[PDB]
Amino acid sequence: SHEQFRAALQLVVDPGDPRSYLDNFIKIGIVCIATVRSSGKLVAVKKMDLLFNEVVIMRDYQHENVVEMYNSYLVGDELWVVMEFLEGGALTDIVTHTRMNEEQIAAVCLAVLQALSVLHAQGVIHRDIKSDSILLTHDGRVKLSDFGFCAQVEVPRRKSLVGTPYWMAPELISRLPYGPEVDIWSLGIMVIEMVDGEPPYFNEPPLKAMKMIRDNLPPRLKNLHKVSPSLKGFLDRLLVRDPAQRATAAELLKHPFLAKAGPPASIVPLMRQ
């Protein structure tokens, strides 16, 4: 915190306020929810009073798979963010108790990939890809959340120590320069999550795990006993230790595993329980 580091802040932010059109607020828990007098839509804000990276970077972007960040303001020492609110939860409330299928799995994967595919050419990297950063509509539509760790990359390589260890890239843990390909390794660990329910080494304290991520072969499935050879095949391309022999998002859409993705509706009954 500092009011000079908040100097390059205010500028990149709309002025005025939201409660000129928006009004019927209510603390819900996240913070608030208002209404649009023009239509009646409600929004959910997250108030406050680096992190630089969400505001500037993603204020220039919008995808149907990314919770839309509408507008940004502050009164005094307090930032107001209008945001696309959804009721439908995170994939973590699902993976942890029941066992998904390839149709549901395939749908979370390509959904996640539809985002990455444009976020990446656009020169940005999530850096915290895991089930926990995925949100769902009540209807069963799939989106990518939580860009509290992102950054904009001449400068095509990066090396900042960030994310969540059990999902991290070896090149990233190993302090070898990486690119967006890290986001690609993370998907596979989220895949292990969808099949077995947990990320590898999750029994371990994070740091030693980061060693075991560091110097063991790519992680293998404990299930497999109910695993179509196609999920292996897809899985088998994303868990590459050599960053360069690792498959690309552009490649993965063309993958036959993805013939099995289901509609939103096909996903709905997982949250229903």
Numbering used by the authors: 300 to 328, 334 to 353, 362 to 465, 468 to 587
Quote the study's own text.
PAKs are serine/threonine protein kinases that are regulated by Rho GTPases of the Cdc42 and Rac families (Knaus et al., 1995; Manser et al., 1994; Martin et al., 1995). In humans, the PAK family comprises six members, which are classified into groups I (PAK1, -2, and -3) and II (PAK4, -5, and -6) based on their domain architecture and regulatory properties (Bokoch, 2003; Jaffer and Chernoff, 2002; Kumar et al., 2006; Zhao and Manser, 2005). Group II PAKs (PAK4–6) regulate a wide variety of cellular functions, and PAK deregulation has been linked to tumor development. Comparison of five high-resolution crystal structures comprising the kinase domains of all three monophosphorylated, enzymatically active group II PAK family members revealed a number of catalytically productive and nonproductive conformers presumably representing snapshots of catalytic domain movements during catalysis.
